[PDB]
Structure formats: C-alpha cells, structure tokens
Structure 1
Amino acid sequence: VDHTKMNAPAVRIAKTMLTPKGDNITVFDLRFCIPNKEILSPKGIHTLEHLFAGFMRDHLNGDSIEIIDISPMGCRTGFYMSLIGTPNEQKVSEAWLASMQDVLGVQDQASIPELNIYQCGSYTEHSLEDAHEIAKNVIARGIGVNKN
C-alpha cells in the first residue's frame, strides 16, 4: 500500500479472512509513526510491546473479540494486531488510546513483569522511558483512521 498516502497515528483494517468453519480473524495495522518520516526505537517498541498487548487485552479483548497476538513491525512503524472477531477502526483506536494511558501508569522497570533473563528474550533491550514518550506522542497526536 502507498505508505506516502497514509497518515499516522491511525488504525487500519490490515486484512480480513474467515475460518474454515465460520469464525472471523481480523488483522489490524496499528501504525504509530508516519511511514519513512519517523520511526520507533528497537528498545522503545520492545518495552512497549509488553505493555500494549497486556492492556489492549483489557480495553479491547472482551467477550466477542479475541486477541491472538500483538507484535511490533519490522519497520518499527507500529504493530500488527491479529484477533479473533472483527472490530472497526473506532473500537480499536479507543482501545489503543486507552492503553497508552495505561502505559504511562508504569513509573519504572521493576513494574514490567517479564523484564528478566529468565522470562524476557533480551533483558537489556528495554526502555520504559522511550515507551512512555511514544504514549505521550500518540495520546497527544490523536489516533485517526487509514482506510485502504
């Protein structure tokens, strides 16, 4: 898709596909930054990821939506979020804008549960600071929409 055309921060129905039986799997482009104009930090995006899916599962992931997974994009310009169900751009965003407020509520590293050799893949690649700025940005800038 034309990354020059799209804007950020903005939800976007990334792809839609059905299950063999009946259930629905929707996949969202949770694009934080403006394609090639800005970029997420390998540490920020990482400490963030932890918190994001812990919180998006709180505001979103209710009873008629199911979260499979939320993980950062290689291009570190936002996360991809596959889920069981099919919310719309409003519903996700509202869930995203909330979460960021949830992230802010974490003053230090010992609050991030995983963050250790025994449970986090790469213990020293965490920046709660960078991951808070992002929240601030997003929360500040507002989460619009990007339709295909």
Structure 2
Amino acid sequence: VESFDLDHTKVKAPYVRLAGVKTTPKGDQISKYDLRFLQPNQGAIDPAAIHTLEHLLAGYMRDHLEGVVDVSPMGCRTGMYMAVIGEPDEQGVMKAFEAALKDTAGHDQPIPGVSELECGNYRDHDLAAARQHARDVLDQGLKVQETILL
C-alpha cells in the first residue's frame, strides 16, 4: 500500500500531489492525485461535509479536467483522491482543482445527486461546511507538493 509510504508529517497542506502513476498493459498512464485540504492529523473534515465535497468535486473536477475516472474522499478525511487517464500533470491538476474549488465555494444551488434514489446516505450532507472548506483552501493557497517518502 503506497499510501503508507508518504511522510505525512512533512507535507504542507493544502496541496495537490501526484500520489502514483500506473500503466495499463499497452502503456497508457493512469495518474492518481492527492488533493489535500487539511494538514494530516490536525483535524478532519466532518463526514457530512466530505460527502458533499465528493458530490460537488465529482462534477466540478470533470468540468475542468479531461479524463477524470473518479473523485473519492479519503478515509482519513483530510483530502480526496482523484484518478485521471493521462500523463502526470501536477500543475494542470492544481489549476483544475483551484477552478473546481471556486465552483464549490460558490455553489448555492442544490447539491447534485442528493435524493434517496441517487445517493446512499442522502440525509448526510453539509453544503455550508463543504463550501467553507473550499474557501479555506483558496484562502490559504494551493501548491504542488513534493512526495517525501518514509
């Protein structure tokens, strides 16, 4: 598990970081990015808020970046993982994430996909908190974080 090899005490959130790159048999690269909102072990995003962030960024990352495969919350609740079909491009992903965070901070419309039909825990959302976490990231400023291994 490559996740456990990053030295979580040495990164500086918020940031974007290439977490890993894998190739398919023919040679296509699948890049995975760590979209980190909070500093590891200094607090966590509430489950309702990260659930709303997942629904919003699922769509907003796709709006600003091609080849997105998935946007998922991390179990540690300090960030999200995003998988993209394409060569590593930390700067491009940082710009996309910034654009998507502006969309997220200003999202005043209903949360996309929230209903008993469309979501598996439809009552567990918190748009006010998700918007504020996006604004906090923008307020602090993103950067491309080097992977510091253990």
Q: Normalised by the size of structure 2, how large is the TM-score?
A: 0.90
Secondary structure at 1:145 match in 2: coil
Q: Whole-Å Cα distance in 2 between the matches of residues 25 and 50 of structure 1?
A: 22
Instruction: Determine the structure 1 residue equivalent to 2:137.
Output: 138
Alignment of 1:8-19 (within 5 A): 8-19=13-24
- Give 2:42's aligned amino acid: K
Q: In structure 2, what is the Cα distance between the partners aligned to 1:48 and 1:14?
A: 20
Deviation above 4 Å: which 4+ runs of structure 1? none
Q: Could you say which residue in structure 2 is the equivalent of 1:116?
A: 115
Q: Is 2:36 the partner of 1:28?
A: no
Matches within 5 A, 1:1-148: 1-61=6-66, 66-108=67-109, 111-148=110-147
Structure 2 residues without counterparts, runs of 5 or longer: 1-5
Aligned equivalents of 2:29 and 2:88: distance in 1? 10
Provide the aligned C-alpha RMSD in A. 1.1
- In the TM superposition, what is the alpha-carbon distance from 1:79 to its structure 2 partner? 0.5
In structure 2, distance between residues paired with 1:58 and 1:9: 21
| TM-superposed deviation, 1:38 | 2.5
Give the total of aligned pairs: 142
**Distance between the aligned counterparts of 1:92 and 1:143, measured in 2?**
11
Residue 103 of structure 1: CA displacement?
Answer: 1.3
Long gaps (5+) in structure 1: none
Q: CA–CA distance in 2 between the matches of 1:44 and 1:90?
A: 26
Conservation of the 8 A alpha-carbon contact between 2:23 and 2:30: yes
Q: Distance in 2 between matches of 1:48 and 1:90?
A: 21
* Contact preservation (8 Å) 2:21, 2:88: no
Instruction: Report the alpha carbon displacement of residue 12 of structure 1 after superposing the two structures with TM.
Output: 0.7
Are the equivalent residues in 1 in contact too, given 2:56–2:112 (CA < 8 A)?
no
Q: Which secondary structure does the structure 2 equivalent of 1:130 belong to?
A: helix
Q: Is the 8 A contact 2:35 2:81 kept in 1?
A: yes
